[PDB]
């Protein structure tokens, strides 16, 4: 659904911070000058300059404390060089409503600790160093109170504002482009029919190969691929015997077509 997150990528000693609304980036952190960078005018949303500075400041301190507070405990913790720590935090909306929030930390690409309720909890998988890592974090509760306030009251207020602020950007409809092609030969006597749908927005889409109304199973949906303009691209393929091919057509359903689907016949 609709989800704003802030991600952290720690390498060991660079450090990256960005803020994303789903697949779309909206915030960047300037390494040199310690500053939240808005990528859209409405990147800022409800908040005001007063607040933003206050938050930016809060992000500077807290990140520092967390960063220096690792090579401080890197040795005590099993953590051996080199390694990467990944943090994702934020909140989501299920049809215009606050559908909960999250904050998860990852060691080496596998889950490590999660923030639940008012404190840190280990993933059982990550073993007995994860359980130790929590004992450290949970030691000062006031730290946990602040984490909690941001996840469950700051973030929800924020995302709502953002949404409203960029209702001209998101909520917009960009009509898709549709064309057909051969794929790699699956074997003698057969073909791969390839339906191309490119440059559509928003992201949900329906693409299926059709024999009249006979929705052909075996239609095979590919990755939804991005472009720098925020639009999406998608291939749907079908393997057929050569003769079967002319009977076939491609049907594309998208929000911007408003009921008038795209139909491409193989002939």
């Amino acid at each position, epitope marked *: 659904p609709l989800s704003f997150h802030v991600i952290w990528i720690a390498s060991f000693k660079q450090n990256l911070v960005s803020g994303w609304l789903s697949d779309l980036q909206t915030h960047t952190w300037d390494s040199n000058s310690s500053t939240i960078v808005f990528l859209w005018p409405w990147s800022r949303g409800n908040f005001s300059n007063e607040e933003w500075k206050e938050l930016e400041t809060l992000f500077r301190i807290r990140t520092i404390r967390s960063f220096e507070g690792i090579r401080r405990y890197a040795h005590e913790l099993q953590f051996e060089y080199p390694f990467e720590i990944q943090v994702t935090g934020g909140c989501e909306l299920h049809s215009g409503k606050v559908s909960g929030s999250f904050l998860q930390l990852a060691y080496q690409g596998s889950d490590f600790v999660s923030f639940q309720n008012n404190s840190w909890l280990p993933y059982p998988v990550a073993g007995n160093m994860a359980k130790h890592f929590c004992k450290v974090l949970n030691q000062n509760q*006031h730290e946990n*109170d602040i984490t909690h*306030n941001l996840l469950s009251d*700051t973030c929800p207020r924020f995302i709502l504002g953002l949404l409203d602020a960029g209702k001209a950007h998101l909520q917009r409809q960009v009509k898709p482009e549709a064309w057909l092609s051969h794929g790699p030969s699956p074997g003698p006597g057969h073909l791969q029919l390839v339906c191309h749908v490119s440059g559509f927005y928003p992201k949900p889409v329906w693409v299926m190969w059709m024999r009249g109304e006979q929705e052909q199973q075996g239609t095979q949906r590919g990755d939804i691929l991005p472009s720098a303009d925020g639009t999406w691209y998608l291939r749907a393929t079908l393997e057929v015997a050569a003769g079967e091919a002319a009977d076939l057509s491609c049907r594309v359903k998208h929000s911007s077509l408003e009921g008038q689907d795209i139909v491409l016949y193989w002939e």
Partner: T-cell receptor
Amino acid sequence: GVTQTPKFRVLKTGQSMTLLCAQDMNHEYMYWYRQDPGMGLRLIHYSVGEGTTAKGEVPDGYNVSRLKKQNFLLGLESAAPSQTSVYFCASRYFLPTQGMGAFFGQGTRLTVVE
Amino acid sequence: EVEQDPGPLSVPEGAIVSLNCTYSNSAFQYFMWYRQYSRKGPELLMYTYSSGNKEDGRFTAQVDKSSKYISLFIRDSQPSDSATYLCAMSTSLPNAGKSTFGDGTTLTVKP
């Protein structure tokens, strides 16, 4: 901790004065309150760091100056009888770790007379 | 806004004293109690985050967010407790470091 200077002062109506608050506690946030007897604290001005300041609930007739991190000056532009009150300076970390709450000075008793 | 029982309170030594504030703004999340002795400055006495109780010696701070009602309880009140008690509250972050003060309650404990 948090110190205020002067501790007492008398002003003829119309005169000016500067109050000076200092703290050696390395605090980012600083505050000037006034307190009238029976009542609580009303915020006049405050500062979130060196060189920036902002208006509180009752800012009129006062100005402030956050010169260093340590010092926060309060200034009476033109004394009026209404400004007869007790003034409290306060500071606190930006992101304290042992809970919220601010540290307070012992106060400045100021009386304006005609 | 923060409405606080004006008092004054005069209780005998040994009594349980109850000090209370009411607020109207639901955004409030940080709750502070200050104690201020005569001719001196406010001193933080109790602090609590969100809903709940915190017990420190003879003192219990209590916050009821749904009722918008907070309370400082003093057990076995000593004459040394005679002072003014002020409550203060901050809203969720970002809160600008600002807090709103009730107008205080002055408590006298008769020895």
